[PDB]
Amino acid sequence: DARRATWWSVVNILVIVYALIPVLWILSLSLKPTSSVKDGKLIPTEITFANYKAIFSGDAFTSALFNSIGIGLITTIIAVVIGGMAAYAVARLQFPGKQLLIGVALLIAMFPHISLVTPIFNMWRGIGLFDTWPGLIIPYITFALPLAIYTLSAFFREIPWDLEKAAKMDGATPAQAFRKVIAPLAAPGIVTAAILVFIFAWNDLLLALSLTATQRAITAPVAIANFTGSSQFEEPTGSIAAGAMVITIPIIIFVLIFQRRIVA
Amino acid sequence: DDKKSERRLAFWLIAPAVLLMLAVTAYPIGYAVWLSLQRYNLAEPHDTEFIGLANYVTVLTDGYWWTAFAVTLGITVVSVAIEFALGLALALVMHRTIFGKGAVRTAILIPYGIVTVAASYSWYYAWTPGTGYLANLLPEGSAPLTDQLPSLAIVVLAEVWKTTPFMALLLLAGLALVPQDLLNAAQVDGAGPWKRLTKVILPMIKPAILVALLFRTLDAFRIFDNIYILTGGSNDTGSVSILGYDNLFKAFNVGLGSAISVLIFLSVAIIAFIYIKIFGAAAPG
Amino acid sequence: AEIVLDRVTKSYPDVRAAVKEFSMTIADGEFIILVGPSGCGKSTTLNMIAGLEEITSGELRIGGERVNEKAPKDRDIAMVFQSYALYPHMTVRQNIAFPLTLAKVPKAEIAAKVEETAKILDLSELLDRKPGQLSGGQRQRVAMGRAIVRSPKAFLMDQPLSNLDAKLRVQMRAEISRLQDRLGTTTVYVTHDQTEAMTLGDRVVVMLAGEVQQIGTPDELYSSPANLFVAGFIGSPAMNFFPATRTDVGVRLPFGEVTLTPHMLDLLDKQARPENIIVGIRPEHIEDSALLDGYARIRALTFSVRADIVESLGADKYVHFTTEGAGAFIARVSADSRVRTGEQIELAIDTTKLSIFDAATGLNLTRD
Amino acid sequence: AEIVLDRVTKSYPDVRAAVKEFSMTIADGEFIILVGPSGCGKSTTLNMIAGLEEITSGELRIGGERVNEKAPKDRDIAMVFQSYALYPHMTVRQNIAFPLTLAKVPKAEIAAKVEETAKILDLSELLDRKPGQLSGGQRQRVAMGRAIVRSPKAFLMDQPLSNLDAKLRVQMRAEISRLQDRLGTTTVYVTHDQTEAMTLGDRVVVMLAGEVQQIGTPDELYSSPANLFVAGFIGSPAMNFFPATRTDVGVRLPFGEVTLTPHMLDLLDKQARPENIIVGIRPEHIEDSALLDGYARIRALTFSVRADIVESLGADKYVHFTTEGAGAFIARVSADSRVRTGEQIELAIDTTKLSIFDAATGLNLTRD
Amino acid sequence: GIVINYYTPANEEATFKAVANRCNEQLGGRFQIAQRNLPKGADDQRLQLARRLTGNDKSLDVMALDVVWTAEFAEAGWAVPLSEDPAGLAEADATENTLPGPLETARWQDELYAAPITTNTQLLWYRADLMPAPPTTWDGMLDEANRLYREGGPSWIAVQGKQYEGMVVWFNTLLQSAGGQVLSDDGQRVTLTDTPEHRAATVKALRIIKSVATAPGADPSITQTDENTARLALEQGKAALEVNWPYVLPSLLENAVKGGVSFLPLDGDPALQGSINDVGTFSPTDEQFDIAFDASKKVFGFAPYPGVNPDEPARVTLGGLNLAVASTSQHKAEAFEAIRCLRNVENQRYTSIEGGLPAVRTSLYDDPAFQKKYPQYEIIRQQLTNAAVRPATPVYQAVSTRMSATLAPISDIDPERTADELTEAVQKAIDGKGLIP
């Protein structure tokens, strides 16, 4: 039907334009020479790549990018798993789903990080994990975990009951039923939790800025913020924009592969 | 027996989560509460004593808290209403659309994957006149960041564009549940394209939209980046997370900057309580 | 409304046609039954009428206007789904009321119609229970309730009584046939149970492998099956069949010669000859030779077979036997029959009830 | 394994009991059929025996020991669900294989069982399509493979042949009977179709509102129904019943008189006298007065009525009639019957085949 | 082996890493200097130091404090005073050639709690083509702005109007040049209206802010301008006048050789073409710098900061960096020896010429190479000799925030009322009461 095709065409170009224009503006702030990054024009002229080769001069950004990949992936892998176990418990099992467990799970996400980070600093001073991946992945997982447990519970609670009756009748042990019956039907929930947790880790600041100080654990979201420039007071705008256009690409590549699974 | 074995399995099954939440977070919460009862200052940690409830009355009685609170509440309800109404629309076109769905599914989620500092500077340079591409569309000398209602409107937009993909994705993932035959059974029973949404789609996804609404709202109340970078603390529009930071990180009054954290925790807890008790289909139900 | 189907189809990639060249017209208030094997395309046909499945080729018309592209809401028809799909989130009263609320009727009149039809569907009161609490034989009733209330341009029904007990089948069949005539409403009804078909149908239609095989009244089908398939499909037990050789006065079967009735022998004279033929005879048209009166015995043929097994239904017995040589076995013997297992019995047949078929084609010769 | 139920119950908060003191031993290799109205504790019983639902009071035993607290996997009895539950991500092939993969059998041997059981069901070729592509009879047939593959400690089945066309049911039932005999394996089966009960059942159980009414062979429920509900329950058409008055040698009917067999009248002397009799006869035991030969005219008794409606199915006529006076009406009569539409008819009954019941208690007094 | 951890702001590493390397050669191997990064945000560097200092971090030795932090780090006992040095020498490398403003700037209750290492000062920058001479007083800036507005030229004055600390630096410079100050020198009393001279100075500073904000043809954005927007407002030729720090000159020349500015079209020059390196950074020959700079003096120029009173030099408020030894440190004598090394005259030269941070030691203002890099050096020397200072007090961060929140937005000022409002507001900060705004 030519009407149905025309309607979806105009809606698709409207949505792509609506979402991407503020990203195209960031790309134009990246590509303009510093003589005209203040010119007021959306479409650039006299384009220069100088701002990318500025941030890539020396390993200080590229190491922070590698750290952000490692910490981001290990956070989503572990938090989806231990959030998955806990979510399946509250969703299907008889007694762990006590309103206390959801109560404490909310309290971790309900309370501001701004207070918590100083007690966390003086812990990692003691334990010795400070300015290293474990002492940064650990708080990441703790503050990610409420979203994973609460989200995945709200999907596992919706897989129809006679599939679980059939799994009992077909003699399957509960972990094997979870593997072969529950998780394949709940896959949009799994994928959504993995995306939301990865993107949460991939641009966190208050913890990463406080619990790191050297290339051993500094991460792209802070290494883009602390860029140098021509002065103590002048904002390095083309370097900030060039940083965002690099640091967003993993957040495209991860989504592009995983969104294949989201279908009914 | 099943029940004796299922609780025994269940206690294994929650074990890593409750341990990892408790062992890391119990001391920070306990210390952040306990500092609230005392005249602690980070510049003289030995010169400190218990002050009782005085750190609560001294914030709760102050017009700086109420002005910041009123702004964070007004920004919260207006942004969440727009982001939810838009969120449904974006979830539906991300679900139904015939035209190569991976293009929309990536292009509509990439805003969430832009770094919060670059996003805030993107909007800040976009709205300064003679220098921002959409600021030049205004009449002469407009400069809308300079005064209260237009700068509040700009931060609502700078929030809606960046976080409507969060709710659109939970809406999409929840909406992928709904059995197509119950939609067909509405359609041949004469339900229109909107009449089925309000009476078949929404009431079946109700427990999933609670998650989207809740975690989104509890995040919106603690706004900071998009109203510190863009128009940093000007013409009275400071959100309460900025009020907390300004009394802690750049004043060292730990004994009060902790009270200004406990009170946003309480106010956010009332919103959390109301959402779960009005929905009823919540996680422990 | 009239309904006209013209060469409609549905087809799918492995392409395979699920429904093929289907063509018919349905008059105002007419009660059509659809019948056939499972997987032959029946629901697929109802999904094409409903608009829930897009037609791959052919044309569909209602009341004299084309409807191929019109959405199901605009077609204004009511359907009972094979799965009896019922919402959650809505207790039975409001679950039944739903289509009336979409029609925006006055709320009091909606409630009155619900609590009338709650009685006529034997659902008890309107009950106020969520569907999760209800048995399969209760859920199928709630699904009927949605369709019963609306008063559509036509009723479509996919095996609407299948999950009910034997009494509720005949009693709900009475409720259906009353209301369909009361509303004068064009009807398509689908069932595997041909005993429903022969009492509900103004006409009956039978399908195989996506294609119609016969159309008629139930008496037309049973008296005059157009092919060996439909001759085997209808009735219970199914028709008995034997391969046989034509004779110039009749037919030479494996047990003897039956002289064909002269008028039908003249039709076999008018007809083109097959190289072999099959006869079909009703098992109830096979009887004990001693139970015939002389005025049947002058036409009947008679023969003997060893009674191997029997089974009973009070008014009748299904005498079970077997015979040497290849097929193309049951007799349905009267209440006064004195049969016992292992006996040699003297049988007879109503020779007027020989249907005859082409053995290569499977086409019936006896139908006009 | 033996199964024993002992005073079991299930009750749901409004509390309402769906099963009331149900009590039976089932022998090793016994083939029980449950039957009843809609919504009367059937599936609730199969859920209690499967362990999918917890008993509220009373006890269940398997193999001579209590099981109320034990896991479903400890019981290891196969089940086919009312919903025909299936795994929608797995193909039909790995759906049917799923219990074998849960049992960790070798891949080639598992595939050989899948082939042998696709053939044993006569289901189809090895289709391997996602279940959401299937037609209704196909889904229910695929849902048999899960149960039939695994050769369990017992079978539970809930309306397993309900959706299929009759030409498949007559095959699949026979396969289930062969397999159940071949494996010697205890079976519960549940159906609306009482014709299945009178061919499968080692015993049949009739239940109403969660309360058992009779237990026995199909012939015992058919020829000696214990109470008026079960007397109305099985065969076709439904049994015909009248109020009547006691006579010093038998019964005075509203339309006639019968001298009873002295032994049946002695049972009416062993039992206390009700204020009125209720009497019953099966429609298939009613005959034309023209059907009385010399032998029959001595044992029969007779009266006359107008046929109110006449209907036919080739093998029998359903002669509807109505008498003067109240009922507590159909006769089923031979293919030889020359009765016409609405005709005045002389009628005959076998005086040995009548049944009599207490009008206050509802119990069969002819029962022994 | 001994190593001394020298903590410095994120943007300075390219200077101090090289200077630490030079010291690691020059010390003769007793100990080494290791350079460490704090964050880029000034109020975030404060917290990372305050955590380590409270957590007894033994890896903390020498710090580059911001200029206004001295009274905080001194009152906390986090900075050890130079009068406690084991050698008796740190206080003697301080003073003996150090500029008097920066030297005084480090002191709390007249003790040196830190040793100055860098200093910076605002200047007035002007379009030398659009006026016959630069204005010497704020009324003269209003006169040239009002003239250019009538004539149809650039009418904006580029300034630090936003609620950031630069508004306090500007206001404090007006208040100081008017002859007042925010606090008593002991920081115990708020002196803005304790006597009519202080009120007069205060209301004169407020009235000058009000005037330059509200005047005809001012920048409509002036409620939100900072150093970044002040610079571009002159580079785009929309302002005629600017008050800014000395970094603006090479930034203009770098923009001019890129063709960003229409009044100085140096991108057309065949000798300047190629003066920018592979990473787009201006790196001229001596002749390219002289060509670019000579062409700029045709049209763009610098002047001493303009006064509040007729024929009176303005007491400009300083920026800078001060070295301090941490009271958690484990190598105190070596840390004072590292500080004395980091302040040697050849490292001050490197910091000034290669590093672009103005020297604090007087002798470099006599070096022709320093005078080549900073053409305005005489005006800097003069202003650094007579400097104002921020009101160094332990509660300074509260005082500065509550004061900046009282001024902004600058259009709403009314001098008498705002002198009252500031007197009240700053007194609450000294009393330690209420929330910081």
Ligand SMILES: Nc1ncnc2c1ncn2[C@@H]1O[C@H](COP(=O)(O)OP(=O)(O)OP(=O)(O)O)[C@@H](O)[C@H]1O
């Ligand atoms: N979840 C439930 N909530 C409320 N009532 C229930 C529930 N399950 C069963 N019942 C009660 O049990 C009765 C239905 O019994 P059951 O489910 O055994 O029917 P059934 O055996 O499936 O009948 P059929 O097979 O003919 O549909 C209902 O009348 C209902 O009151």
Ligand SMILES: Nc1ncnc2c1ncn2[C@@H]1O[C@H](COP(=O)(O)OP(=O)(O)OP(=O)(O)O)[C@@H](O)[C@H]1O
């Ligand atoms: N969505 C689909 N995709 C692919 N094949 C299908 C689909 N739906 C049906 N089919 C196939 O086409 C045939 C159409 O049969 P249909 O679904 O009409 O069943 P039916 O004839 O109504 O019998 P039943 O009453 O058992 O459903 C089926 O045999 C099925 O295998």
Ligand SMILES: OC[C@H]1O[C@H](O[C@H]2O[C@H](CO)[C@@H](O)[C@H](O)[C@H]2O)[C@H](O)[C@@H](O)[C@@H]1O
């Ligand atoms: O509410 C809008 C903001 O939501 C996100 O930030 C919130 O969630 C983070 C989780 O780490 C918190 O650190 C942060 O304090 C919250 O504001 C989002 O990252 C922001 O971009 C949005 O502005």
Ligand SMILES: [Mg+2]
């Ligand atoms: Mg069907």
Ligand SMILES: [Mg+2]
């Ligand atoms: Mg059932």
